[PDB]
Amino acid sequence: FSPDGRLFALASGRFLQIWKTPDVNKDRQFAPFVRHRVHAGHFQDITSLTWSQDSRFILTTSKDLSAKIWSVDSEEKNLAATTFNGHRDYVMGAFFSHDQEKI
Amino acid sequence: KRILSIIKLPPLFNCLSNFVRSEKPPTALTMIKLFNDMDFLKLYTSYLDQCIKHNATYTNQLLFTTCCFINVVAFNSNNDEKLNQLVPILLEISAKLLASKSKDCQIAAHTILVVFATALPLKKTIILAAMETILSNLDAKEAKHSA
Amino acid sequence: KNSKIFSPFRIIGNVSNGVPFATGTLGSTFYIVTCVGKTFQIYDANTLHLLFVSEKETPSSIVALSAHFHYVYAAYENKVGIYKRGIEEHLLELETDANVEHLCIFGDYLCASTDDNSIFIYKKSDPQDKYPSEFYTKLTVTEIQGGEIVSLQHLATYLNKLTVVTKSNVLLFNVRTGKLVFTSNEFPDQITTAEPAPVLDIIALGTVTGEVIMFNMRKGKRIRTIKIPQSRISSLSFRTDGSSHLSVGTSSGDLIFYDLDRRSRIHVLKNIHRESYGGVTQATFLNGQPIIVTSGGDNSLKEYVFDPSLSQGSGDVVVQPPRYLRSRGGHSQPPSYIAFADSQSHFMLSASKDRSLW
Amino acid sequence: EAAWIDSDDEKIKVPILVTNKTKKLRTSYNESKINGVHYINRLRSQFEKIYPRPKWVDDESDINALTKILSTTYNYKDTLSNSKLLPPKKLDIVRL
Amino acid sequence: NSIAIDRSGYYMATTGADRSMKIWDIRNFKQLHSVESLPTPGTNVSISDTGLLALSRGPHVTLWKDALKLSGDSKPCFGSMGGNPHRNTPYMSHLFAGNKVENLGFVPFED
Amino acid sequence: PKVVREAKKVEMTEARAYNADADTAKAA
RNA sequence: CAUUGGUGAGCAGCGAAGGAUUUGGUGGAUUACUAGCUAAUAGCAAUCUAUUUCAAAGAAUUCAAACUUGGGGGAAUGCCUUGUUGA
C-alpha cells in the first residue's frame, strides 16, 4: 500500500501494476478495485516494490539486473524515468533516503 | 478394382474401405450405402453439374446414377426427415438434368422425379413447377413418352 | 426504499434480455456486450467468460448499445453513456425529451437517433482523444423524406456520411455539412434490419415480409433479393473468411444460412431460440471466423461453428452444416424457488416457471 | 455510373501521416496531404485488400421454375387440411 | 545471453543482457559492430549458412542480411532515418505475439 | 463403415478488419 | 432332490408415434469472473517504418566462484597446488 493509503501496487511477473484502494466504508461491489496503471519496463520478473515517503514515486527491483523509478501520475513522468544498472546479480531492494535524494 | 487397390481413399468414400486390396468387387448394396450420405450426395450432384455443363453425360453413367438415386430414396422411404433433407438435393439435380439437351439425361431426371413423387407427397406448386421444367426443354420422342 | 442492513450487490443468472448485443474486438480477440435490463455484461467470445459488469445500474433500461475497441456506448432513457471496463467515462445528455433508440459510431462522430426521428451528432474535440464528447449538429428525418428510423449505420469508405435506414427508405447524410446527399427509391414493404456487407458500398436490408434486399448504396439499385416466405427477418450477418455466406435470423427463432456465390441455401437451424421471447434477436459472425454468436430474448447466448468441409477437393459445394459450440444461459422465465446448495455460499439451486432447475 | 455526388469530399483535404493506419496508403514518401476523392479511392482499395472482392456482387445481379420453387419453399409436403385422406405408413395418434 | 558463429569461422554475434548485440571478427579478434540499446535484451542469435543474422528479443524475431561484414554501412539498424541506403534495416521480422521464444535454429539446407 | 462425422477442435484466428475512424475528415 | 450353474422356449407384471447395451468426437465445469498485442504513464488492433537515432547512466583484486563426487586401492600420461631453473 501507499503511505497515504489510497493506492496499492504489486509486482505481478514483470509488470508493476498500481490499483487504487476501495473504501472500507463503501458497500461491497462486484468490482471494487479500479485500475490506476500497469507499467512494463523490466524484462524479467520484479522482485521488490518501494513507495516513496510521499506516495508519489515507486521504485521497483527486478531479476533483470536493473531497478526503475516510476511516478504515480503522468505529469511527473519526467522526474521519474531513469533506470539503475550496474549490479552483477538480482537486485534485491531499492530504497529512497529520508529526503528522497539518495537511492 | 485396380484403382481401389492403388487409391488412398477419401473420407467421404469411407464404406469402400473393406474392398480395397480385396479380390471381390464392391456390391450394389455397398454402392447404395455409399450414396446414402448427404455430403456424398452434394458431392455427386456437383460432379454431375460439371458433367452436364461440359456435355459429357453418357448413358451408362445416367443409368448408374439414376439407379443409385432411386435406391437412396427407397432406403429413406420410411423416415420423412431424411426424405425432407433429401428433397432439395435430388430435385435440384433433376432440374439440372432437365435443363440440358440429352434425351437420356432428361428421362433420367424423369425417373428420379417419378420415384420421388411416389415416395413422398410433394407440394402442388412444386409438382406444377416440375411439370413446367419438364415441358420447357422437351425436344425428343422417347423424352416425350417419358414426359 | 434505501436499506440499512442489506445493500444491493448484483442480479445473477442473467445473460441477455433480447436487446441486440454488440460485438467488439480488442486486437484479435472478441468480446460480446449484452444488455441485462439496466446493466450490460461483457463476455469473452473465445470462451464466453464474464469479463465485466457495468458498475452502476442505469436509471432506466438500456435500449441500444454498441462497442468500439475499448469503449462501450449504452443508450438508455435520454442519454448515451460511454463506458470503459464497466466504469462509466462519459455521459452525453441529449437536448431532447425523446428516447434515444439507435446509435452508430464512426470516425470522430457518434450519431444517436431518438424516437421522434431526430438524429444527434456528437464530435470529438481533437481527433486524438478517445470518445466523441461535444455536441456538433442535429439531423432530422421528416415525413416527406422517410418513415420511422429503423436502423442507423455507416457502411465503410464513406467519408463522413451516414446510412439512415427508415422503414421505407434509405437516406444518406453527410454529417459534417448536415446535408442529405441521397434518398433512395421506396421499398414496397417495411424493412426491419440492416447490416453492411463486407462488399464495398453494399448494405443488406431485411423486411417485415420475408425478403433480404442487397442494396448497392452508390448505384442506388438493389443487387439481389432473397425470399423467405412468411418470416419476419430480425438479423443479418455476413461471413468474412473467404466463404461468402449470409446468415439471416428469423423471429420464429430460425437461423437460415445462404450461399451468395452459388445462390443455394446451406442449412437452417430451427428453434435456435424461442419465438415467444423474440426469436433470434441478434446473430453476428465474428469476422474472419467461421463462428457465429446468436442471442435471443429467452436469456440465452449461443455460438455455432462451421467445421471445415468434408470433401478434400470440392469443399465450396459440400458445406458441412453449422454445429453447436459453447453457450451461456439462464432461466427464460422468472424463478419460482431458491435455495443455497452449501454452507460456503458458492452454489445456489434455483427453479423457475419454465420448468428448469439451474 | 453513380447515383449521387456530394460536392464536399472534393474540397476536403486530409492528412495521411498522422496515424499509423493511414500511413500505408501513400504512393510516395513525399505525400503528406491528399485530396478527398483520392483519399477515398486509396482506402477503397485498402478495404478491397482487407476484405477481398467476392464473385456474388459482380457475377450477377437479380426452365428455372423448379429451382425457383425449391429456393422459395422450406417445407415440401402437404400442409394441414389440404390432405383430406390419410397418409400411409406413418400414423398421427396421441394418447388420451 | 547468446553466441552464434558463422560456418566460415569468421564472425561471431554475441548478445548481452545490457541490450547490446555485438558482431566480432574471430580470426583477428576485432570488434566489427556494436549495436547498443536494443529495445529489450536479445535472448538469442543465430547465423544461417548464407550469413543471415537472426536475433530474437522475446516475442520478436528479426533477421538482417549482410550484417556480418566489415563496413559501417552493414551495421544492423532498425529503421532507415529518412531512407538512407547505407543503413542495414531488417531483412525480415516476425512477432510471436503470445509468447517468448526459447531458442532459434536455422534448418540446415532449406530456407 | 459410414462416414465419420467428428468435430474438430476449433481455435480462432487472426483477422483484419476495416475500422471506420479513417472515414471522417475535417475541413480547413 | 438341490443348483444362490451355462444356454434357450415362453407367461404374468411394467409399458404415451418404441426399448436395451456399447462406443467415437466436441463443448461447459473440475480454485473466486477486472478484456488482446507491443519497445507500455501510452500507442496499436488496417502497421510500425522514412524519428528508433543521439545524449546520459552503467565495468568489485569477487582480476573469487563444483556448497553438485557410490565404496576400497592407485594415478604412467593428464589435471590441481606449492616450490624451482631458464628467459
Coordinates of N, CA and C (backbone and C1' of nucleotides) in Angstrom, one line a residue, chain A residues 30, chain C residues 9-17 34-37 39 41 43 50 53 296-301 328-335 338 346 348-352 354 356 358, chain G residues 33:
Chain A
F30 N -19.4 -5.5 -7.1 CA -19.0 -6.6 -7.9 C -17.5 -6.5 -8.3
Chain C
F9 N -26.1 -6.0 -4.5 CA -24.8 -6.4 -5.0 C -24.8 -6.7 -6.5
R10 N -25.6 -7.6 -6.9 CA -25.7 -8.0 -8.3 C -27.0 -8.7 -8.5
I11 N -27.4 -9.0 -9.7 CA -28.5 -9.8 -10.1 C -27.9 -10.9 -11.0
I12 N -27.7 -12.1 -10.4 CA -27.1 -13.2 -11.1 C -28.0 -14.0 -12.0
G13 N -27.5 -14.8 -12.8 CA -28.3 -15.7 -13.7 C -28.8 -15.1 -14.9
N14 N -28.4 -13.8 -15.2 CA -28.9 -13.1 -16.4 C -27.8 -13.0 -17.4
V15 N -28.1 -13.3 -18.7 CA -27.2 -13.4 -19.8 C -27.6 -12.4 -20.9
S16 N -28.9 -12.4 -21.3 CA -29.4 -11.5 -22.2 C -30.9 -11.2 -21.9
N17 N -31.4 -10.2 -22.6 CA -32.8 -10.0 -22.5 C -33.4 -9.6 -23.8
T34 N -23.7 -7.7 -23.9 CA -25.1 -8.0 -23.9 C -25.8 -7.2 -22.8
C35 N -27.0 -6.7 -23.0 CA -27.7 -6.0 -22.0 C -28.5 -6.9 -21.2
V36 N -28.4 -6.7 -19.8 CA -29.3 -7.4 -18.9 C -30.1 -6.4 -18.1
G37 N -31.2 -5.9 -18.7 CA -32.1 -5.0 -18.1 C -31.5 -3.6 -18.0
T39 N -28.1 -3.1 -16.7 CA -26.6 -3.3 -16.8 C -26.3 -4.0 -18.1
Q41 N -23.2 -6.6 -19.8 CA -22.2 -7.6 -19.4 C -21.3 -8.0 -20.6
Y43 N -18.6 -10.3 -22.4 CA -18.2 -11.7 -22.4 C -17.0 -11.9 -23.3
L50 N -17.4 -14.2 -18.3 CA -17.9 -12.8 -17.9 C -16.7 -12.0 -17.5
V53 N -19.0 -6.4 -15.7 CA -20.4 -6.0 -15.5 C -20.3 -4.5 -15.3
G296 N -30.8 -14.5 -28.0 CA -32.3 -14.3 -28.0 C -32.8 -13.7 -26.7
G297 N -34.1 -13.4 -26.8 CA -34.7 -12.8 -25.6 C -35.1 -13.8 -24.5
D298 N -34.8 -15.1 -24.7 CA -35.0 -16.1 -23.7 C -33.9 -16.3 -22.8
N299 N -33.0 -15.3 -22.6 CA -31.9 -15.2 -21.6 C -30.9 -16.3 -22.0
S300 N -30.4 -16.2 -23.2 CA -29.5 -17.2 -23.8 C -28.7 -16.6 -24.9
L301 N -27.4 -17.1 -24.9 CA -26.4 -16.6 -25.8 C -25.6 -17.8 -26.3
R328 N -23.9 -19.7 -23.1 CA -24.3 -19.4 -21.7 C -25.8 -19.2 -21.7
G329 N -26.4 -19.4 -20.6 CA -27.8 -19.2 -20.5 C -28.3 -19.1 -19.0
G330 N -29.5 -18.7 -18.9 CA -30.1 -18.7 -17.6 C -31.6 -19.2 -17.6
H331 N -32.4 -18.8 -16.7 CA -33.8 -19.0 -16.8 C -34.5 -18.1 -17.8
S332 N -35.4 -18.7 -18.6 CA -36.2 -17.9 -19.5 C -37.4 -17.3 -18.9
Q333 N -37.8 -17.7 -17.8 CA -39.0 -17.3 -17.0 C -38.5 -16.9 -15.6
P334 N -39.2 -16.0 -14.9 CA -38.7 -15.7 -13.5 C -38.7 -16.9 -12.6
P335 N -37.7 -17.0 -11.7 CA -37.6 -18.2 -10.9 C -38.7 -18.3 -9.9
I338 N -35.9 -21.0 -4.7 CA -34.5 -20.6 -4.4 C -34.0 -21.3 -3.2
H346 N -21.5 -20.8 -2.3 CA -20.9 -20.9 -3.6 C -21.9 -21.2 -4.7
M348 N -26.1 -22.0 -5.7 CA -27.4 -21.9 -5.3 C -28.4 -22.6 -6.3
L349 N -29.3 -23.4 -5.8 CA -30.3 -24.1 -6.6 C -31.4 -23.1 -6.9
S350 N -32.0 -23.2 -8.0 CA -32.9 -22.2 -8.5 C -33.9 -22.8 -9.5
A351 N -35.2 -22.8 -9.2 CA -36.1 -23.4 -10.1 C -37.1 -22.4 -10.6
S352 N -37.5 -22.5 -11.9 CA -38.2 -21.5 -12.5 C -39.6 -22.0 -13.1
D354 N -40.3 -21.9 -16.2 CA -40.0 -22.6 -17.4 C -39.5 -24.0 -17.2
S356 N -37.3 -25.6 -15.3 CA -35.9 -26.0 -15.3 C -35.4 -25.6 -13.9
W358 N -31.9 -24.8 -12.3 CA -30.5 -24.4 -12.6 C -29.7 -24.4 -11.3
Chain G
rC33 P -11.4 -17.4 -10.9 O5' -12.4 -16.5 -11.6 C5' -12.3 -15.1 -11.7 C4' -13.1 -14.5 -12.8 C3' -13.2 -13.0 -12.9 O3' -12.1 -12.6 -13.8 C1' -15.3 -14.0 -13.2

